[PDB]
Each structure stands twice: as C-alpha cells, then as structure tokens.
C-alpha cells in the first residue's frame, strides 16, 4: 500500500525563450512517469501545477495525455487537484486537465479507496485565491466532518501555508484539520516535516523553473515522493525521496583572475552541458569563448572593471546644522508654525 506524491511540473514553460529549456521540462516529466511506472505505485497524487499555462501547446497536452493514459492502463489511480495555473480565468474556456478526465480523478471533494482490504480516505480541492479563503475553510471543515470515521486520511491542496511561504500564503497553519499526510503544491521548495500528528509535504517542482532553485538542486534533488502507507500511521522513515536528473547550472561571479579557474573543472564535473549565469569581467570573455560548445548558453553579464538621515549628512557636509534643516523641513511641509520655531534658534543656539 504505497503512493506517489508529485506536483509542479509546469509543462510548457519555455525558459529564456529557448527551445532546449522547453524540452528539458518534457524530458524530466517523461522520466518521472518512467520511474513511476517502474515502481508501479497503487495511487498517484498529483497536487497541482501540471501545466504552466491555461492554454498550453499541443505538444505538452499530447505528452501529458499519453503519460496519464499509461498510468491508467497499469491500474494506477491518479488523483489531481487543479493548480493556480490551471483554474479557468474566463467564462466558457476549460482547464487543460479536462483532457485527462478519463485517466485521472480531478479532486474537488472526497473519495475512498480499497487497497488490499483497507479503506483509505482521499480528499482535495483546487487552488483557492487568498480572497476566497472563507469558502476554502468551509470546504476543509466539511472534509473534517466526513473524515472522523477513517483512521487513514490524506488531504490534497495546491495552496501556500503561512509558516512555509511568507510572501504569498493563502492559508494559515491552524486552519488545516488533522490528516495523516498533506499532499501540497504551488511552492517549488521540496518540504517534508511533521504537522498535526501527520506528515506535511511539498513535493516541489520537477525541473528548475525560477532561477532560485538550482541552489536547491545541488542540496535537495528534484523529483517526487514515494510514501509507504502500509502501517496504520505515517512517519518520516517510510517516505523515500525520488530524485530526477535536471539541467546543470554553473554560477560564476568573475571579477578576479582566480574566478576563471573555477569554471572548466566545474563545467566538466557535471552530468550534462550546463547553463552559466552571473557576472564575467569583460577582460575574461574572449579567452572564455573556447568552451562555448561544452556549455548550453551563457546568460552572463559582461562587466567593465533613508533620506531623513542623508539630508542632515549633506547639511553638515556643507557646514550647516542638519537637525535644524530637518526640523524646519518638517515645519513647513506639515504647514506648522515655522515662525514660532525660527524665533527661538536665533536667540539660544546661534553664533
């Protein structure tokens, strides 16, 4: 009784307006499907952001379609919740996931599964924007009422939880009811920690989407989760992280002559021909062109070679009492009595 937690594939994302970066997403996704089929898990939980846009290219739809057809043909039930890039924005248009309706269960509610003689409760919903949180809570509380009977329960959400993503969080932590496992998405940081006598998990992205995520890939490989829910409860021990192979990135900040030596030995000591970014001193570029074949592309820069405090700083640099300049600056801009304030300075503190 094992399942796979995967999310944030962003199929169709064409980084750097470059064909190769568009293909690399397809390859990493196809390889995720390949490993999943090699494992043959009982259930696949895709927790959002499969596609990158609401009207993805025909190729991405064909790739995803044939992938989930393969998963359905091998008697693997796939449950999905719509991501933020998949919620239809206009009236008559449909989500891309509607093409996968006959191979994947799009979760907007409850469902129970029999796995070798045991009822497991799966529930989930689509991406709720921060405005409609009150509706979302009513969806969650309902999922609480229908769950007290089942000792094994899992919640699929494509949201941001407050203590994990502070920038754009749509839900707080205390609004989440107790579940054995949380299959979440929308943040590409791979996260795994205990939460309310259970395991909260962000499967993370599959390929490096935004540039802040190669620092993760060297530390935390990208891929999906394989969870062993055979026992009655869940811990961190029975969760194996599956890492996929991504496009290598090489970061250089060449402002010195020692920063050219770091290059070749790192560019060769990686799996595939990487992408270099950062800053290269102008004097180093022409002697750097020798290995532009052992690299993919070089998005590197060619480099050549608080007012309230600064006003007082300036006034003292010119030789004038800064605190007077500031207090007066406030006196007239706030349309206060500059007469009552100026008449004192000439008397007490002048020379």
């Amino acid at each position: 009784m094992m399942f796979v937690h995967i999310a944030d594939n962003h199929l169709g994302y064409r980084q750097y307006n470059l064909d190769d970066r568009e293909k690399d997403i397809y390859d990493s996704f196809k390889l995720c499907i390949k490993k999943i089929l090699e494992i043959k898990p009982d259930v696949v939980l895709h927790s959002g952001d499969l596609f990158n846009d609401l009207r993805p290219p025909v190729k991405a739809l064909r790739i995803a379609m044939q992938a989930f057809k393969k998963l359905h043909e091998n008697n693997i039930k796939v449950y999905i919740v719509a991501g933020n890039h998949e919620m239809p924005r206009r009236l008559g248009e449909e989500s891309p996931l509607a093409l996968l309706k006959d191979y994947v269960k799009i979760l907007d509610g409850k469902d129970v599964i029999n796995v070798n003689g045991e009822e497991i409760f799966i529930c989930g919903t689509y991406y709720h924007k921060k405005s409609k949180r009150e509706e979302m809570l009513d969806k969650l509380k309902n999922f609480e009422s229908e769950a007290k009977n089942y000792k094994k329960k899992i919640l699929m959400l494509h949201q941001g939880i407050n203590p994990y993503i502070p920038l754009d969080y749509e839900l707080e932590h205390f609004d989440l009811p107790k579940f054995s496992y949380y299959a979440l998405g929308h943040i590409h940081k791979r996260i795994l920690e205990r939460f309310n006598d259970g395991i909260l998990a962000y499967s993370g992205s599959t390929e490096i989407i935004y540039r802040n995520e190669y620092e993760d890939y060297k530390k935390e490989g990208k891929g999906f989760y394989l969870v062993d829910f055979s026992g009655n409860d869940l811990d961190i021990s029975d969760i194996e992280k599956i890492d996929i192979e991504c496009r290598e990135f090489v970061e250089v900040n060449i402002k010195d002559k020692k920063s050219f030596n770091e290059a070749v030995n790192k560019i060769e000591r990686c799996k595939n021909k990487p992408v270099v970014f950062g800053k290269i001193k102008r004097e180093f570029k022409p002697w750097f062109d020798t290995l532009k074949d052992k690299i993919l592309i070089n998005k590197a820069i060619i480099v050549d070679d608080n007012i309230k405090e600064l006003l007082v700083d300036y006034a003292n640099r010119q030789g004038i009492d800064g605190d007077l300049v500031l207090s007066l600056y406030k006196a007239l801009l706030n349309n206060e009595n500059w007469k009552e304030l100026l008449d004192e300075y000439y008397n007490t503190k002048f020379r």
């Binding site: 064409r14 750097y16 307006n17 470059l18 846009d53 609401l54 009207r55 890039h85 924005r89 206009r90 924007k129 405005s131 409609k132 570029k285 998005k299 820069i301 060619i302 480099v303 050549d304 007012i307 600064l310 006003l311 300036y314 006034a315 010119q318 004038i320 007077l324 300049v325 007066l328 600056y329 007239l332 801009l333 500059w338 100026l342 000439y346 002048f350 020379r351």
Partner: protein, 358 residues
C-alpha cells in the same frame, strides 16, 4: 505619493451611460474587446481629478445622445478619504470635493486647486507618472532633458524639497524686513546684537541653497542613480535580452551595452524600447519601495512585445511588491492569469457594461 483609488461612478460619460466600478489593492486587470469602454474609465478618472479642458471637450466626453455628464470618485491618499464629484447639466458645470464625509471644495476651480496640492502633481505631469496611455509608455523616456529631469523629480519624491525652497523665499524675505527695520534706519556694546541678526539672516539663505536644485536635490538624485540602475538591470534581465548591462546616466538618459558596441533607445526596437521603459519605471518604484508607495495605471503595455516578452512581463508584475495597486488594461490573455481582480467590460448597444470578478 501614497496614492490609492477606491471606486468610481459615471453617468453618460462617453460609452458608459451608467457604471459603478470597484477597485482593489493588487494587480487589477481590465479586459474587453476593442472600443468596449476600457480606456474610457481612465479618461473618466482624469476628468474627475482635473476639469474639462479645451483638449477635454464636453461634446467629446458627453454620450453622443445625451446632454449631461456626472462622475464621482472615491480615493485615499496619505490616509485620508476623498470624494470628487463633477457634473455638467445643460450648459453650466459644478464640482464638489468631500474629505472624510464633510465637503472641502464647492467650485470647479476650487476642486482643481485642491487636487493639485493634495497630489503634489498637476494635470500634465500626472500623465507622465500615474496614468500612462497607449504607446506613451516610452514617452517618459523621450521627454525633453529639462522635462525629463522635471518629471523625474516628481517620480522620486524630490519635488517636495522645491516646495520648501520656494517657501524659504517667503521665509528669508520676511526675516530680511525685520533686518530692514534696523538697516533702513541706521543712517541719515549692544552694537554686537545688531550683528547677531545680520549673521542669522545670512544663515537662512545658505539653508535655502540646501533645499535648492543644485544643492541637495541634485545630490540626492546623484546618490539615487546607482540604485535605480541596479533595479533596472534586475528587471530588464528578466526579458532574457542579449545585452551586457543597462547604464543609466545621471541625466536619466539610458544606454544599453552590447558586446561589440553601445546602443541607445533610438536604435532599440519598439519592443526593446518598451522593455527598457517598463523596467525603468519599475526600477524607480523598487528604488523607493517604502518611501513613495504610489499607484500605477497602464493602458496596454504588452503591445509591441512578442509572446515570450508578454509572459515574462506577467511574471515580473507578479513578483513586484513595490507598488500597492497597479491597474492594467489589456487585450491579451497573458495578464488575465496573473491578476487578482479581473474587470470584464463588454458593449451591448454602443453602451458598455461592467462585470467585476474578485
């Protein structure tokens, strides 16, 4: 400029016979077909702030069948709630301006006079800062040198110092007459007290030179250039364009560094021009991210940009946290998917209809 709009109501204004539209804090996206009433809303707001001019003809803004026009506008600035009301009945016009319930101005000219001081921005410089029309995204770039630094002063909040420098001219002169009261009489021990006041008045003028143009304004701007250059590179690089880096002179003229040469905005394509203009405006916003929380209005900025640059621009807008409320008009779907509130505008029988989606 802690500027934020709330809602607007309009009667018989161009294509909008009657419409009340609510605004929200965030990326407010206005969508519709061509001529469905999108730009007309902002023409209405501009009418509320500044009365009809010769360029703002009533016969131009009246609904071609009707003979009157009415519009009220709620907004907040620096914590205060304001309500502007403008009407033209059958030949005579009137205006009321309320501040937190009770009225502040009752005549048209009084309302204009109040607006220009509450905003610190006039009619003409309002179009180069807050309300950017179609194609005029790069207009702020190509302005006259004097006009360029003039609108830059407002964009950076430096202009308020000039308000002191002129008011100092009122202050200095006054303290001069208290000196004239001794000077206009000292012709035709305690003589040191005569020199005290003289040295004091002499102090006031150098203080005025601190607030002057060449004094601290130019100094603060010169200290502001590198930051705006850094942010300008941060946002411009998001367009994956093949250029070394974007140099910003102290005169706010932009230079783009190519590998085998240096180009200017003249040589750049229209799309690259828009890339630079937008990323520079956002560099000014991100420069004073908390100093001047201004709202921004754009009318079709993604025009002249290809598919990829439109998309990248959308992600750029999503990562922008420096501007509290940015309202964008578009015919393109690349910005529907990134907005928080989407305002759909359609047209029935030459009459526009508004449908707000929160």
């Amino acid at each position: 400029m802690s500027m934020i709009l709330k809602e607007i109501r309009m009667n018989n204004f161009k294509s909008h016979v009657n419409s009340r539209i609510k605004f929200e804090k965030g990326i407010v996206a206005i969508i519709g077909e061509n001529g469905s009433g999108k730009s007309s809303i902002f023409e209405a707001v501009f009418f509320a702030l500044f009365g009809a001019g010769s360029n703002f003809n009533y016969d131009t803004i009246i609904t071609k069948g009707k003979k009157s026009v009415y519009v009220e506008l709620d907004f907040e600035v620096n914590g205060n709630n304001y309500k502007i009301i403008r009407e033209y009945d059958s030949g005579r016009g009137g205006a009321k301006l309320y501040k937190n319930g009770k009225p502040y101005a009752t005549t048209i000219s009084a309302v204009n006079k109040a607006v220009n001081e509450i905003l610190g921005v006039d009619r003409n410089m309002f179009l180069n800062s807050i309300y950017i029309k179609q194609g005029e995204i790069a207009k702020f770039l190509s302005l006259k040198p004097s006009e360029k630094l003039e609108t830059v002063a407002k964009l950076l909040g430096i202009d308020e110092f000039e308000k002191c420098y002129q008011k100092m001219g009122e202050i200095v002169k006054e303290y001069e007459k208290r000196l004239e009261r001794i000077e206009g009489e000292l012709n035709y021990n305690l003589e040191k007290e005569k020199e005290k006041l003289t040295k004091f008045v002499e102090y006031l003028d150098k203080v005025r030179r601190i607030f002057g143009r060449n004094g601290f304004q130019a100094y603060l701007r010169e200290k502001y250039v590198p930051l705006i250059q850094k942010y300008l590179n941060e946002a411009f690089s998001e367009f994956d364009l093949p250029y070394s880096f974007v140099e910003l002179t102290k005169d706010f003229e932009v230079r783009v560094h190519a590998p085998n040469g240096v180009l200017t905005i003249d040589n750049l394509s229209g799309g690259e021009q828009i890339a630079v203009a937008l990323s520079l405006r956002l560099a000014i916003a991100n420069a004073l991210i908390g100093n001047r929380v201004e709202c921004i209005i754009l009318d079709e900025p993604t025009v002249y940009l290809d598919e990829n640059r439109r998309a990248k621009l959308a992600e750029i807008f999503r990562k922008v946290k420096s501007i509290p409320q940015m309202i964008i008009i578009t015919h393109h779907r690349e910005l529907e998917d990134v907005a928080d509130v989407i305002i759909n505008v359609k047209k029935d029988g030459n009459v526009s209809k508004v449908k707000i989606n929160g």
